[PDB]
Design a protein around this nucleic acid. Sequence first.
RNA 1: CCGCCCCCCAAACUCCGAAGGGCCGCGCCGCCCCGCCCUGGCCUGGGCGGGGCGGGCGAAUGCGGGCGGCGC
RNA 2: CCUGCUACACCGGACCGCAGGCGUCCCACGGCGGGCUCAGCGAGGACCCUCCCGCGGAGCAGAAGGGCACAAGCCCG
RNA 3: AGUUCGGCCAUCCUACGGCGGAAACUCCUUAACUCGUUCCGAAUUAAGAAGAGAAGCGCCGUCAGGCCCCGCCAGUACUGCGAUCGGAGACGUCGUGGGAACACGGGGUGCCGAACC
Lengths: 68, 164, 266, 153
Amino acid sequence: RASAKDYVKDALRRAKFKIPGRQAIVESRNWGFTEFTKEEYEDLRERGELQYDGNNAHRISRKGPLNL
Amino acid sequence: ENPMRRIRIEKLVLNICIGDALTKAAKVLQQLTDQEPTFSKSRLTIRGFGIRRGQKISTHVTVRGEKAREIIERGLRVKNFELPYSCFSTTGNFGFGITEHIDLGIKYDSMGIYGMDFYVVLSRPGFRVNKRRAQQQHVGASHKITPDEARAWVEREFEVVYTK
Amino acid sequence: WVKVQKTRSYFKRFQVQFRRRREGKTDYQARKALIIQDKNKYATPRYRFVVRRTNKDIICQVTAAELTKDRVVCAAYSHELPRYGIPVGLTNYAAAYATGLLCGRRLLEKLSVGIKENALAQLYPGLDKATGEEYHPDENENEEVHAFKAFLDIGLARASTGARVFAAMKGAVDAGLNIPHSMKRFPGYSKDGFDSSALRDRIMGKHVGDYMAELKAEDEETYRKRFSKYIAAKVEPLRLEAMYTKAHAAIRANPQAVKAKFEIKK
Amino acid sequence: THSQGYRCKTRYCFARKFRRHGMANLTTYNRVYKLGQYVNIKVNGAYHKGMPHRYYNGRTGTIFNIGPRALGVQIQKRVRGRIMLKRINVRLEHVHPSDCRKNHLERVAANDAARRLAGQPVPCLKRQNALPRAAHVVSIASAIDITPLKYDG
RNA sequence: CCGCCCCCCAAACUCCGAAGGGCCGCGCCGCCCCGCCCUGGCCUGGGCGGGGCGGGCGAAUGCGGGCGGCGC
RNA sequence: CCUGCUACACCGGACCGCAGGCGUCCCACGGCGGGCUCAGCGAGGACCCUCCCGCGGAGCAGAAGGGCACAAGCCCG
RNA sequence: AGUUCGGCCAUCCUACGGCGGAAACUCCUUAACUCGUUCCGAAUUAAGAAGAGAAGCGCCGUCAGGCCCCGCCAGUACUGCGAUCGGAGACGUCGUGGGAACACGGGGUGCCGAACC
Ligand SMILES: [K+]
Ligand SMILES: [K+]
Ligand SMILES: [K+]
Ligand SMILES: [Mg+2]
């Protein structure tokens, strides 16, 4: 969330000193551990075709039996 | 309403499990169906249950026609015209079991008492397509028998009450 | 709650059998062992004599297998016999035998259309009197024009002793075809002697006449139910031997086919 | 290696193809063969009698002997400085009629056909390997202008 | 227990599958007849040969080729 | 001597390389013909029986790999 | 339109619903004879012709599973030949040739041949 946004890179810097060689710290454009970007996920949640699950978000299906 | 959909008694199977007690039980089914019965061997060894493999474990016989129907009527009358609601298989058969064989009819116990499994299998006209040899298919799911139709038919024919 | 047996993966893995195996109309092991032939023979035709039964009909066909299909040379259906003088009872032993005779005569006359001196119908004219005894056109052994040779294909039916497919094979043999065979699975075989009268009995259909007589003797009501078309056509249970005899006479006289024009509706 | 039985190293080449198990189709026996014909060798792994060694899978040869059940096939096989003409006896499930001269027979027939059909001048019939392309005109009234893009990462 | 998602794997896993290799072919053909003998119901085939008329040189580049004996 | 891998998609390719096997067993555990369908899941039935679906999830002496369903498996002559 | 015999072996399979029958195939009726059931005419064998479109079969359907085609994925992954190119290395780069798969989206859902009604 926005609470730890300042300190995640500090923790990863702690982690980097335990691994052999050269490692890069980066901030992704995606939304969490989901596969959309933040702005695309925005519009998608706004229009509503976005399927929810436990901790991950999918799309409308559109294939298979109609309802039953 | 259409013919070809009338229910009928496909077959009745009488089954007995347990020295020469099977010989005497074979006499019992022999004289009670007028068909030489058949024996069945033991697949495994369950020494807890007390059986080797090659042993003749069970005996059984299968009756059909008016004969099967009459014997199954008398079996229900032993059961006092009562049947559990849950005794009807999801595939359209049912059955039960008596505990004292002479409850069919006075027989000098000679041969000793046994208890039996009655198992009734129902079918409809046209079920040959799944048992013939050439051009063998599966029966239509709609032409198949539901347990609802099965209980309905059995109650309308033999007038048996349903315990629950 | 319960695992589902028919899944994505099950369907992806599934191999379908040949169409005619799925429909249950062909055994390919027997088909291989019938149409096999030595490779230094280079496309010389091989012939099956196919006997098939339905409910209400009997079919006999002479066939050769090519690459993409197979040619039926001659055919003969037991529903033509009403034209030769056999009105009812079709699909019994006598009708199977008679239809075999018809197919044999028709094939040999067909392939002896035109030949002048040495023709497979003048040579090898069959057997006449309907005696129901052992006979083999290959013992004759003409050294210049051999007898026509075929092998009996019977598909999915059982090869029991006293079967109508063997009856039809017998009728083809009497018509004059080379069909290699034993007399086992014919009526009248005791493994230390074979007889002819116990075979002519079923060829001439005495069992049916005896059954009509005794059934009419005890239960007339069920006589009417069992045999209604026999009664309607008034063929008495005692004239069958004459009817079969004349039927054979006509079949030998005119084996040629006549094409019944028809009009089929969708 | 340390082991060279007859079917060593055959885990994949002798296995049957996906959804292609079971009995062979009957063209395998209704095909007609002749002396001098060309054939490919392909081992069908369900039929064990008259099954050639693994070296012969994927080769083309000529029939020298027509037999009652098996065919005789000649294969040229390289050994350590020379070619040897090997002769093998193979049952029908492992041979297919080869098309290695199909194109040649097509071209010979077409050559004679066009000679008969001649249009009065006889066309050049020798195969010609792709030439450099001739001069021509292309319109450029609707050009699209592209450029390298920027690195995006 | 069951169904949908999901992070990460295999020299002795593979429904898919390259680059790369491998084997064979690239000149004589068509149409008609006639002779000889295992194979076929036959006036069938298959093989080996003779004749008679139509034709014909059918990718590139380079270039003469094949066989044996004796011996280090 | 044998199977799979090492081995780099024709063949071939080393090590006191890796994971293993062989010196036997069967007149039936063999030949042929016919008939049959296996492992099981689900649902039923007095304290083995029945149906239904069932691409082999079984079996085929013993290693491993491959093969097989009106069969190459099981039963009968 | 149908039946028998086939070719290629799912664009043909599986599941659930619906619609048909003049002729044809099928369900179907019987146990004297024929023959047969680890027991059972269920199967099969023999002998029929009263009754059916309920099944099998033909056909239609389903934001159906499977199967098949096309485009995209993507000149990406990988790779043959050449390099006194970079880098401590692990690895990468350039020149000249070859070039996928998964995923994703739109489409489709047996035809050919001999004989008879
Ligand atoms: K580090
Ligand atoms: K070698
Ligand atoms: K129907
Ligand atoms: Mg057979």
